[PDB]
Amino acid sequence: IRVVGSEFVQKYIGEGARLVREVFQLAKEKAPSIIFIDELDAIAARRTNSDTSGDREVQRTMMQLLAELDGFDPRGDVKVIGATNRIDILDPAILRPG
Amino acid sequence: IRVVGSEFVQKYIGEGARLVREVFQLAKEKAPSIIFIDELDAIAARRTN
Amino acid sequence: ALNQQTLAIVNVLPTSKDPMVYGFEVEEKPEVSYEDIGGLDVQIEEIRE
């Protein structure tokens, strides 16, 4: 699974939700898989609450992301792999052990 | 309710306090409530004058 | 729930029944126990106090 997290958030706010829920559903059926998500630097740091166009979109898409990732893997079925350029600039959210 | 101590302080500041305010509210609404607040040495430091 | 032609509340949907929460992680009733680290038995008794 190849998708970029720059595409996760998209123009005019609340575009959108479907990409976040589809990636994980899609994975569960294609399993064994092997979802790569893929670089997170502005989509899974922290937010202001809120400057409202930026901040809301980014917060929403994070909440939707974390719930799904938590729920299909206590055990393997779909293994999750990923990558990041820097874990310095990103704030705890996915750096939580859940 | 979890506060990670790494989200504490910037180099000019205000969000660090804001999330303290936030969890304080979440705690009152959901009484009784326990706020685990790790890690108390990045928000506390010596007294000076 | 409203009727949109007249803009009036006709019927009322349940209170809550909406996921997603602010100030995560938020966990009502963990099932994680105090036995998960043993041999620090007298320290569980003190935080209980």
CSV table of C-alpha atoms in Angstrom, one decimal:
chain,number,residue,atom,x,y,z
A,1,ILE,CA,0.0,0.0,0.0
A,2,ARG,CA,1.5,3.2,-1.3
A,3,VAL,CA,-0.1,6.5,-0.3
A,4,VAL,CA,1.5,9.7,0.9
A,5,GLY,CA,0.5,11.6,4.1
A,6,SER,CA,0.7,14.9,2.3
A,7,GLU,CA,-2.4,13.6,0.5
A,8,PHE,CA,-4.1,12.7,3.8
A,9,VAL,CA,-5.1,16.3,4.3
A,10,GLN,CA,-6.5,18.0,1.2
A,11,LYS,CA,-8.2,21.4,0.1
A,12,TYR,CA,-11.2,23.1,1.9
A,13,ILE,CA,-11.8,21.8,5.2
A,14,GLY,CA,-13.1,18.4,5.8
A,15,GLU,CA,-11.8,17.1,2.7
A,16,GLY,CA,-11.4,14.5,4.0
A,17,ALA,CA,-12.4,11.5,6.0
A,18,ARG,CA,-12.8,8.7,3.5
A,19,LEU,CA,-9.0,8.2,2.7
A,20,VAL,CA,-8.3,7.6,6.5
A,21,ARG,CA,-11.0,5.0,6.9
A,22,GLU,CA,-10.4,3.2,3.5
A,23,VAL,CA,-6.7,2.5,3.9
A,24,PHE,CA,-7.2,0.3,6.9
A,25,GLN,CA,-10.3,-1.6,5.6
A,26,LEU,CA,-8.6,-2.2,2.4
A,27,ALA,CA,-5.5,-3.7,4.2
A,28,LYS,CA,-7.6,-6.0,6.4
A,29,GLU,CA,-8.9,-7.8,3.3
A,30,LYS,CA,-5.6,-7.7,1.2
A,31,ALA,CA,-3.9,-9.4,4.1
A,32,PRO,CA,-1.1,-10.6,4.4
A,33,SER,CA,-0.2,-7.0,4.0
A,34,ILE,CA,1.8,-4.5,4.4
A,35,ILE,CA,0.6,-1.0,4.8
A,36,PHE,CA,3.2,1.6,4.6
A,37,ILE,CA,2.3,5.0,6.1
A,38,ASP,CA,4.8,6.7,5.3
A,39,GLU,CA,6.2,9.9,6.7
A,40,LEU,CA,4.4,12.0,9.3
A,41,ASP,CA,5.7,15.6,10.2
A,42,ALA,CA,2.7,17.9,10.2
A,43,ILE,CA,-0.2,15.5,10.3
A,44,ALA,CA,0.6,13.7,13.6
A,45,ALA,CA,2.5,16.4,15.6
A,46,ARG,CA,0.3,18.7,17.7
A,47,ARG,CA,-2.1,21.5,16.9
A,48,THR,CA,-3.1,25.0,18.3
A,49,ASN,CA,-6.8,24.6,18.9
A,50,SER,CA,-7.5,26.5,16.6
A,51,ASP,CA,-6.6,28.7,13.8
A,52,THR,CA,-9.4,26.8,12.2
A,53,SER,CA,-8.9,26.0,8.6
A,54,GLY,CA,-5.5,24.3,9.1
A,55,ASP,CA,-5.8,23.1,12.6
A,56,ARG,CA,-9.3,21.4,12.4
A,57,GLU,CA,-8.5,19.3,9.3
A,58,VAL,CA,-5.2,18.1,10.7
A,59,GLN,CA,-6.8,17.2,14.0
A,60,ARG,CA,-9.7,15.3,12.7
A,61,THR,CA,-7.6,13.2,10.3
A,62,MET,CA,-5.3,12.3,13.2
A,63,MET,CA,-8.1,11.2,15.4
A,64,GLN,CA,-9.5,9.0,12.6
A,65,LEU,CA,-6.0,7.5,12.0
A,66,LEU,CA,-5.3,6.5,15.5
A,67,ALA,CA,-8.5,4.8,16.2
A,68,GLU,CA,-8.3,2.6,13.1
A,69,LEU,CA,-4.6,1.6,13.7
A,70,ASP,CA,-5.3,0.6,17.4
A,71,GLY,CA,-8.2,-1.7,16.3
A,72,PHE,CA,-7.1,-4.1,13.7
A,73,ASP,CA,-3.8,-5.1,15.4
A,74,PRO,CA,-3.6,-6.5,18.9
A,75,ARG,CA,-2.0,-9.4,17.1
A,76,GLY,CA,-0.7,-9.6,13.5
A,77,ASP,CA,-3.2,-10.0,10.6
A,78,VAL,CA,-2.1,-6.7,9.1
A,79,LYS,CA,1.4,-5.7,9.9
A,80,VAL,CA,2.1,-2.0,9.9
A,81,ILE,CA,5.3,-0.7,8.8
A,82,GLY,CA,6.2,3.0,8.1
A,83,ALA,CA,8.9,5.6,8.2
A,84,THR,CA,9.6,9.1,9.1
A,85,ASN,CA,12.3,11.6,8.3
A,86,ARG,CA,12.4,13.0,11.8
A,87,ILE,CA,10.9,12.0,15.1
A,88,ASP,CA,12.5,15.0,16.6
A,89,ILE,CA,10.0,17.6,15.3
A,90,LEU,CA,6.9,15.4,15.8
A,91,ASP,CA,5.1,15.5,19.2
A,92,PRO,CA,3.7,12.4,21.0
A,93,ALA,CA,0.6,11.1,19.6
A,94,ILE,CA,1.7,8.2,17.6
A,95,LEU,CA,4.8,7.9,19.9
A,96,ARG,CA,2.5,6.5,22.4
A,97,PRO,CA,2.9,2.6,22.9
A,98,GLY,CA,-0.6,2.0,21.7
B,1,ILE,CA,-6.3,10.9,31.3
B,2,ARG,CA,-2.6,11.1,29.9
B,3,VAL,CA,-0.4,14.2,29.7
B,4,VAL,CA,3.0,13.5,28.2
B,5,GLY,CA,5.8,15.7,29.6
B,6,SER,CA,7.5,16.1,26.2
B,7,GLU,CA,4.7,18.5,24.9
B,8,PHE,CA,5.6,20.7,27.9
B,9,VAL,CA,7.4,24.0,27.1
B,10,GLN,CA,8.4,25.8,23.9
B,11,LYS,CA,10.8,28.6,23.5
B,12,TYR,CA,8.0,31.1,23.8
B,13,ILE,CA,5.1,29.6,25.5
B,14,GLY,CA,1.5,29.1,26.1
B,15,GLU,CA,0.2,25.7,24.6
B,16,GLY,CA,2.0,23.9,27.4
B,17,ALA,CA,-0.3,25.6,29.9
B,18,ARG,CA,-3.3,25.2,27.7
B,19,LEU,CA,-3.3,21.5,27.7
B,20,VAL,CA,-3.0,21.6,31.5
B,21,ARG,CA,-6.3,23.7,31.4
B,22,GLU,CA,-7.8,21.3,29.1
B,23,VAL,CA,-7.3,18.1,31.1
B,24,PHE,CA,-8.4,20.1,34.2
B,25,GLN,CA,-11.7,20.6,32.5
B,26,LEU,CA,-12.0,17.1,31.3
B,27,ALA,CA,-11.4,15.9,34.8
B,28,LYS,CA,-14.2,18.0,36.4
B,29,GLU,CA,-16.8,16.9,33.8
B,30,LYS,CA,-16.1,13.2,34.4
B,31,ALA,CA,-15.8,13.2,38.2
B,32,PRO,CA,-14.2,11.2,39.9
B,33,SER,CA,-11.1,11.5,37.5
B,34,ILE,CA,-7.5,10.7,37.7
B,35,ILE,CA,-5.0,12.8,35.5
B,36,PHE,CA,-1.7,10.8,35.2
B,37,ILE,CA,0.8,13.5,34.6
B,38,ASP,CA,4.1,12.4,33.4
B,39,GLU,CA,7.0,13.6,33.4
B,40,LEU,CA,7.3,16.3,36.1
B,41,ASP,CA,10.8,17.7,35.6
B,42,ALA,CA,10.1,19.4,32.2
B,43,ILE,CA,7.5,21.6,33.7
B,44,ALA,CA,9.2,22.1,37.1
B,45,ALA,CA,12.6,23.3,37.8
B,46,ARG,CA,14.5,25.1,40.5
B,47,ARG,CA,13.4,28.3,42.3
B,48,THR,CA,15.5,31.3,41.5
B,49,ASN,CA,15.2,35.0,42.0
C,1,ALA,CA,-34.1,15.4,15.0
C,2,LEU,CA,-35.9,18.2,13.3
C,3,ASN,CA,-38.3,18.5,10.4
C,4,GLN,CA,-36.5,20.8,8.1
C,5,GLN,CA,-39.7,22.3,6.3
C,6,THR,CA,-40.9,23.9,9.4
C,7,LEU,CA,-37.6,24.0,11.5
C,8,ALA,CA,-39.0,22.5,14.7
C,9,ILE,CA,-37.8,19.7,16.9
C,10,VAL,CA,-40.3,16.9,16.4
C,11,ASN,CA,-38.4,14.0,17.9
C,12,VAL,CA,-35.3,13.7,20.1
C,13,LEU,CA,-32.4,11.4,19.5
C,14,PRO,CA,-30.5,9.9,22.4
C,15,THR,CA,-28.1,12.0,24.5
C,16,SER,CA,-24.5,11.1,23.5
C,17,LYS,CA,-23.9,8.1,21.2
C,18,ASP,CA,-21.0,9.9,19.5
C,19,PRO,CA,-17.5,8.8,19.6
C,20,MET,CA,-14.1,10.5,19.5
C,21,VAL,CA,-12.7,12.5,22.4
C,22,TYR,CA,-10.6,15.6,23.1
C,23,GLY,CA,-7.5,15.2,25.3
C,24,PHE,CA,-6.7,11.7,24.4
C,25,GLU,CA,-5.7,9.1,25.7
C,26,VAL,CA,-9.0,9.1,27.7
C,27,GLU,CA,-9.8,5.7,29.3
C,28,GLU,CA,-12.9,4.9,31.5
C,29,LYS,CA,-12.2,1.9,33.4
C,30,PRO,CA,-8.9,0.3,32.5
C,31,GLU,CA,-8.6,-3.5,33.0
C,32,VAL,CA,-4.8,-3.1,33.6
C,33,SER,CA,-4.0,-4.3,37.1
C,34,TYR,CA,-1.6,-3.6,39.9
C,35,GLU,CA,-0.2,-7.1,39.7
C,36,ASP,CA,1.5,-6.3,36.3
C,37,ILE,CA,4.6,-5.3,38.3
C,38,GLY,CA,4.9,-7.6,41.4
C,39,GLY,CA,7.5,-7.3,44.3
C,40,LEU,CA,6.8,-3.7,44.9
C,41,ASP,CA,3.8,-4.9,47.0
C,42,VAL,CA,4.1,-2.3,49.7
C,43,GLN,CA,4.2,0.5,47.1
C,44,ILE,CA,0.7,-0.5,45.7
C,45,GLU,CA,-0.6,-0.3,49.3
C,46,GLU,CA,0.8,3.2,49.8
C,47,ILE,CA,-0.7,4.6,46.6
C,48,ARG,CA,-4.0,3.1,47.6
C,49,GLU,CA,-3.8,5.1,50.8
